[PDB]
Structure formats: structure tokens, C-alpha cells
Design a protein around this nucleic acid. Sequence first.
RNA 1: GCAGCUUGCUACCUCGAUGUCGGUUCUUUCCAUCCUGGCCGUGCAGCAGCGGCCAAGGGUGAGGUUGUUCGCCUAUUAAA
RNA 2: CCUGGGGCGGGACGCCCUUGAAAAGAUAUCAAGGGCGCGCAAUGGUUGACUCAAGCGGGUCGGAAACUCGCUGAAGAGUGC
RNA 3: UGGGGCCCCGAAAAUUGACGGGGCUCAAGUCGACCACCGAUACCACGGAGUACCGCAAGGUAAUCUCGUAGGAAGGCGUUG
RNA 4: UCCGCUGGUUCCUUCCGAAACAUGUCGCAGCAUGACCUGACUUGAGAUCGUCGGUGGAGUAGAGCACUGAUUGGCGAUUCCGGGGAUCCCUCGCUCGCUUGUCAAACUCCAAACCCCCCGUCAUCCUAGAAAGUCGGAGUCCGGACUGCUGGGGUAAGCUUGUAGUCCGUAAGGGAGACAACCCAGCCCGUGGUUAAGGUCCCCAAGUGUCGACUAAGUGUUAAUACUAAAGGGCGU
RNA 5: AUCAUUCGCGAGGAUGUAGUACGAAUGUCACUGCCAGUGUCGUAUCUUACGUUUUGAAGAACGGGCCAGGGAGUGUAUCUU
Lengths: 159, 153, 57, 96
Amino acid sequence: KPGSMYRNVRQRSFTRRKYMGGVPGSQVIHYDMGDKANTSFPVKISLIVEEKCQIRHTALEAARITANRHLVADTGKMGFYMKLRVYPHEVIRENKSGMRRAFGKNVGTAARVKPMQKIFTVAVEKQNFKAAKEALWHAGQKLPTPCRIVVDEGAELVQ
Amino acid sequence: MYAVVRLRGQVNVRYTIEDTMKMLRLHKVNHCVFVPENPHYKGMVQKVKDYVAYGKIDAKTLAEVLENRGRLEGDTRLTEEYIRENTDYDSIQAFAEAVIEGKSSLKDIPKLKPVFRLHPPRKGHAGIKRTVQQGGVLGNHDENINVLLHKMR
Amino acid sequence: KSFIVKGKFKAGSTWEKFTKKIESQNEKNATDKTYSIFGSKHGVKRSQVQIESVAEE
Amino acid sequence: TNSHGEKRCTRYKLQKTVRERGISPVSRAIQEFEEGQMVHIDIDPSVQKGMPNPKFQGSTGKVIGQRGRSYVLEVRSGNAMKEVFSLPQHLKPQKY
RNA sequence: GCAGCUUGCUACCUCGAUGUCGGUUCUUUCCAUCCUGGCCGUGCAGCAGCGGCCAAGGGUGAGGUUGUUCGCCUAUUAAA
RNA sequence: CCUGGGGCGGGACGCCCUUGAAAAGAUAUCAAGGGCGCGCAAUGGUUGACUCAAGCGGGUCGGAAACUCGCUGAAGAGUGC
RNA sequence: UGGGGCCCCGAAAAUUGACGGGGCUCAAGUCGACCACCGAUACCACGGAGUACCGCAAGGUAAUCUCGUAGGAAGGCGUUG
RNA sequence: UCCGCUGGUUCCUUCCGAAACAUGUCGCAGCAUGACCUGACUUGAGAUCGUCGGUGGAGUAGAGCACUGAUUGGCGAUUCCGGGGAUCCCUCGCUCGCUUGUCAAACUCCAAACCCCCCGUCAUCCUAGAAAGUCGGAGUCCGGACUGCUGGGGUAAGCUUGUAGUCCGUAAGGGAGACAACCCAGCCCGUGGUUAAGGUCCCCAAGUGUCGACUAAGUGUUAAUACUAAAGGGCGU
RNA sequence: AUCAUUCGCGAGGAUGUAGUACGAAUGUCACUGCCAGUGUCGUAUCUUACGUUUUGAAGAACGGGCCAGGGAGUGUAUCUU
């Protein structure tokens, strides 16, 4: 089931779970990675999508896994903080006869994100900026939208 | 004094915009009307901004338009003799200066038509798919409406 | 016949400053060449180029 | 399927603002209108009696008579003239 | 993402009929190349493999079951 | 009869509410959420008197499962479905 | 290091074929502007026809009259008696 | 015989000119009634397709978490209701708040632009007859398309089903290679001129036009359109 | 048109010449013996028949080989206008 299926935004939101039935649970477990308690990380980069798309929970989990692995390998287990800002709120449904009564059954969840919306934010120290940037590029390679990294804090600390 | 000259025809126009055109008496392309500067006419011109070119006309351009293209009932051409016999002004230039200054009115010419059916613009205009601010001809020409009126004589 | 044209232009999503040095006949010619150069180099229309100043250098 | 009741699609039509729910100001219920006066129809959801159809909410009617407590109004609906009966609790005078 | 060679979806053309599957005969085309030609890597000593690139000039057969397409099996074969 | 051919399935075949429906009105689909084919001499009318849910503190094997006191409480209750 | 323009790789289909074709490289492509010209039955002018309304008539007005399927209305042509 | 089903139905000009929609129907290839077209008459002074200002309706977009529900950590407490191995000797998930991070067709403390009723105003039409009324004759209830509404549904569809405007249907002529509906334009006949869209190297009327740059790939030489290949990468420029 | 002056980086623009010479046409005077029309062919532009079913017809949707003739809203009763 390719991500190109539930990728384009052509429809209203579908999120009120009390009027639907049986949504499969999301695959994404954690939303905060690295050192969750510390907030005094000087450099703070983020990954913003540049198109209006829907990102499935499996794509979110894949990007989170790759970014977390890269960050843990490079900066260490507590050398970074990672926050996945968006939750999969939209309910993705599928039409499983033909086209009679084609209103689909709920098959998953997705986050409906807007252009320039932050998806992941990574806070690190000065010397770990390139490792965080490389990991976040790897994470963006798993998403169904073109992405760009932006520096939120520490611009003068990097250059 | 707004000068409003229609540059786009009636096919594929909303009925509201076309009725605004009819109320301004602009039924055909290259037809021009002169209206006062009140907010009513301002709103009508803003409504029809996408099918006309408009601006502030000066007395010289008004005089030339009146002389070359003003008509009377029965399709008679305005003349200085008619102007002097039916108005207190000596010449068409003085009458147009009075009209621009606001101390006279085109309705002060008996049997004169409110529509001036101008020639097509010599050497073309800027184009009817873009506005003045985009390099086209549609919309607000300000005082440069007189240039288009001069080339449409 | 050298001019310095300072301004800012929209490069996609972000505005960018510039202080270009231009060889031209006069100041308005330099402004026209600035607009043409930025249209060529970035595909931006003259509404997307804001020439703050032109000064003989 | 969709019904054809009077209260069709009245969820927000027959709502009150947050800080006007409850007993409405009673002054609006004892206001008298003259013949030919123009009055708006702004239905009060708390007054469950005398209420015209919500289709005429937001319309200006002309008072043409009185039928007890209620007023008879000539109201334009598309191209027809309707006689709408309304208690003054749902009515409101036009200000000139 | 590509193709439209599987199956679906749809109902735009054809119901004053465009003869329906498979095989046979004959011609042609594509390359995403099975062999044949030229290359590169190799955890390539040689023999022989594995992976990839170019290349459509030629070849790509004979048989048992089954209407079969497909598939299974047999013995040849550079490959079938 | 409807029907993304027909059939099977179903009834969107009568009535009522929300969304769809694009802040007047109207608006389709085998569109989404659904409900109704009833119950009640009181579960009805009127008058009087009161104020609910839920928390906090006090009160005896009356246990953090009762009842009662005080404080908060525009309603988070109740109003048959 | 970031943000941009154009181009390249990614990029494989079946008769010989499609920027319309030829062809075109400081362009005959793209981007930002500009100049002149060509080019309708549009618009202007003249003449003419019909139409609508008015007018006893003569005639007057028409920028606000002149496309048209289903279809309505009016006036005419033709055949035989 | 009958059929709601198929085929045909013969001269000219002139004036006007639709609907492919709603409800009911053993209704769904039909019909009735209404909307829409046309003709005539009566009546006799207003009407509103447009503007501007004002009195009113907003609950859509957007925004937001104040309600209803979702939703992510950090921090502080519920000495409460509860998961773990006799003084319930001590471990602690939910629950309730202060901060972070996200949401909603069927949420709203907020809240547009359109739009709608009414009042005034200008504007247009109107005694050569407004609005209104009465009557005669119908056609029509297979529609389709483009541009928006992220319209709904759908993986999508030159798919299906809505809505506003405009078109084809019933629309010439000019231009896009051809093009029902894309651009100009609505078109009585003849002549002359100037333009619109689009184009100006040849085919083909007019530029081998000007200025400033880019492209080396024959990339491109393709307004819209379903007739135009993506993610990713490039010390190509 | 040509030329003069001026502006513009440039292609070109503006002013004057010039609303001039010309110009649809309307009259008039000479000259001429053809013209209109018809058949066929050529050059230039345009057009994929007709009727029908159709949202959409040049259709690879239906109908006609051709020509002549025949070939389709009529009467009674009743109602309305």
C-alpha cells in the first residue's frame, strides 16, 4: 500500500473518532527523544515540509526511527533532544462490489500538515549541529513530501 | 470626471457586471462615457474594472473627443455653431473646460447622446488580459487615460 | 559609467538584499539593467525586485 | 435520510450566544409596533412560542396588522410575499 | 515512480452484430537481453559462477498430459 | 420500483434531528451519524415552596458502599425514548 | 553554509513520425522589459435592406434593434377546383 | 388492435425564443402540475439587474482550545478509587492543576470576504405603459463542458454525484495544427479604414526587431484543457 | 511619404510639414466597343455531405445505387378560448 494513495489533500478532515468505527492504533510510540528533561540546548534545528500533504503514521515512525538511530549513534544517548510535533489525527480509510457504497473503512491514521509546518525539532549543542542536520536529512528522506531543515536557535552559534 | 471606455465584449461576462455595463451605457467595445466623481460611479467603475479602462480626463481631451466623436439625435455631428447656439460658451474647448471644472454638464447640450463611440486605438493598446499595473490596459489609468483617449479619436 | 544598485529581491520564499555593481549609461539605465539581470538570474518580475537606491560609484 | 421538519438545519439558527442564554430581557416582549413599520425577524430560541420559520430569520418584514399578542408581517422570500405571524419577542424595530 | 503486457474500477464508442478462447500459418515491432558480440565489478587463481552496463543483427527448437493461455515433466540445445 | 448493468445484499421506498451544504434560501449520491411506527390519569395543567450534577471538610463496626451538616457550584443535572 | 534561475542524471514499448513541419544555439529557446508592424463579419465611416415603437400622413427615433434548436406569433409564394 | 418503444411527416421570409430542473406518479425510455418560452388583453405608476451609506441575519473560510471530544512530554499534587511480593513495614499507572507540542464534518471564547431582507441614495428602465392580474399555444423533466468551491464519494478516472458563473446544446466569423463548449467576438447586405485575440526565420500577412542576462541539454521551440513524468541527487553552469 | 528639430542606450518616439497629398463614394467631361451572363480549367482563402438518434455525427452509429411518380394533422360529437 504505497504512501502515494493517502498523500494528496483533496478532502475535508476526518478526525471525530466517536462517529466512526474501529481505527487501527498508530505505530508511532514515542514523540520525545534524547534528553527530555534538559532544555538548555543552544542549537535547535527543525524539519519543515514545503508542500501540503498527509503523512501516515508508518512514515512518521520510519522517519523517527532513522533520526533517532542517527542521533543516538552520533551525539550519544542523551546528547540530543528530539520532538515529533504532529500527531496522526486524520483517519485514513479505504474502499475494500465495486463502487456501490464506496465510503471506505478506516485503515490507519495520518497527520495533515501545512506548508512550512514543523514536523521534527532537534535540539543539540554547538558541536553536534552537523550530525543533527545529517540525521534530519535522513529522516526527511522517509517522508512523502519535499522537506527543508531550518535553524531555529543557534544561528550565530553555527555561523 | 471619470472617463470610462469599454475594451472587452459581452461574451462570458457575469450578468451583474454586464448590467453594470448597461447602466453605464457601455454596451459595446470602444464605447466611452463620462461620469461624475461620486462614490456611486466610483463603485460602479470598480465593479466593471475588468472590462473597461478609466481615468481622469482633461479639458483638451474632452474637447477633442466631443468635437471628433460627439453625436446628436439623428446621428448628427456636434459643431461649434450648435455649441454656441445651445450653450453660453463660445467654443467646444471652453465648454469642455467648464465641464471639467464642474460648472457645466453634458446634459446641458440638447439631444446629445451620452455615449461616444470612439475609434479603435491606433497602434493598438496594451492588451485586455492584464491590468495597468501588470503592463496591460484594463483598470485604472489615472491621468494617463488621456493618452488612450487621444490615440482613440 | 559605473553604478551601485542597492535593494532587495524575493528569492523563492525569502527576500534577499543585494548591492550589485553595474556598468550602464545612466541611473535609469542601471535600474532597467538591474531589473533585467534579476529577471534573468532568478526569473522574478520587476514587481518582485525592490531597488532601494542607485548611486554613481 | 434527511427529513423535512420545520427545525431542519437549525442548530446554529436557533442558538443563543453564550452570555445571553436563559431568560431574555423582558422589555422586548411588550414593545408595540405601528402599521407599516419595518421590523427585523431575529428569532429568540428561548421563546418557544410565536416563532416564525427559521427561513425568515434575518429578514425585514412590514407590519400589516395584529392578531392579538402577535404581529402580522409582510416578508419577502425570494419573489413571494408571505404573511408571517410573530410575537414581539422575536421582532425588533428597524432604525433609520 | 514507469509500463499498461494480470485482475479490478468506470460506462465514453459499438446491440438495423466490429464473429467470441486456444492452436496453426505468415509478417512485423519493443527491450525491461535467455543465448550469441563488447565491457565493468567480484567475497573474479583457472574452470565456472554471481551482479551490473551497452547492444534487438541473428537465434530462441523437438516431445508426453491438458482445449488450454498458464503451468508441470522429458531429452537435446549456445539458449531452448 | 430504486440500483455505478441486472441479480444477491439492502431500502437512502413514509416521518424526525446533526453533518455533507460553500456564514440568506435551495441543493444530489446504495453520502456520514442516526432515530421513529411508542410510553405516560401522570411521567399531564395550574399555584406555592425549593434547587440540581460533582467535589472539599465534619459526623458512631451507619467503612473510603447509605443518611445528615457546612462550603463551592449558570447547570458540568433533570426535562420519558 | 543557506536561499535562488536554467540545465543534467533519475527517464524502458511496441508500423516510420511528430515543437503543426522545415529547421533553429549572443536563437527562430527561456526569463525581465520595450519598440514597430501584420491580423476579424469586432469598432469607426458611407450607402442599402428589414425590424420595433411613435406619427392622420409626410416621416421621426434606435449606443440602449438585426445569432439561433424545441417552440410560439405575423405576413407571403405555389398546386387543383 | 394496442405500445410510454423505432422510423418518417413535403414551400418562403419576418418577430421573439427555451428547458434538459422541483414534487407526485407500479414512477425511472412516460405523464401531470410548477419554473422557464411565446401571443393577446386588462390595469395605470412605479420597478430594481448595478453602485454607495446605514439598520439587521450571520457561524462558512481563517483562527483558537473557552464547551464537547481527541492529543505530546516536563513539573507539582490528589496522604483518595488502583499495577507489584499482620504494623497494609516502603516501591507507584491513571486522576486533578502549571507549563510544552498537536487536532476536529458531525467542537467554538472568536471571526472575515461573498451573500440575503429592509431603508435612503445615485444609476437604469418606465404613460411609445412599471409592478400586478387574466386568458390562448407550447416545448421540457437522457444533458454535457470550462473556471472556482481543498465541493461529497473514490487509489484514481475524458469516473460518479452537487453548487455559483458562463458557455456548447442552439453560436457564425477571426485565432490556437486540427479542437461542441479554450482566447477575441456574439453575426442583416456591400465598400473603405483601424483594431481584438494571436502572431511577425520559411511554410504564412508582418521583425533573421531592440536592450539585459540564462541555457549546450535539439533541453526547449506545449495559455487553459487530462493532450505536459516524480522522489532523490549534481565540485553542470 | 519625404525632409527639419528634439528625446531615447537602442529598436524607435514626439513636434512641424499635415489633418496636407490621398481616400469609400458622389457628380461631371472625354475616350472606348465591349460588358453582364453561361460552361470548363487554373491560382488564393474557407469548408470532413445530407436527414436522423444523440450531451456530443465526417464518423469505424442508423437511412438512401440512381431517376420519375405516389407518400403523412383528417371528419363527427362534445368542452374551452
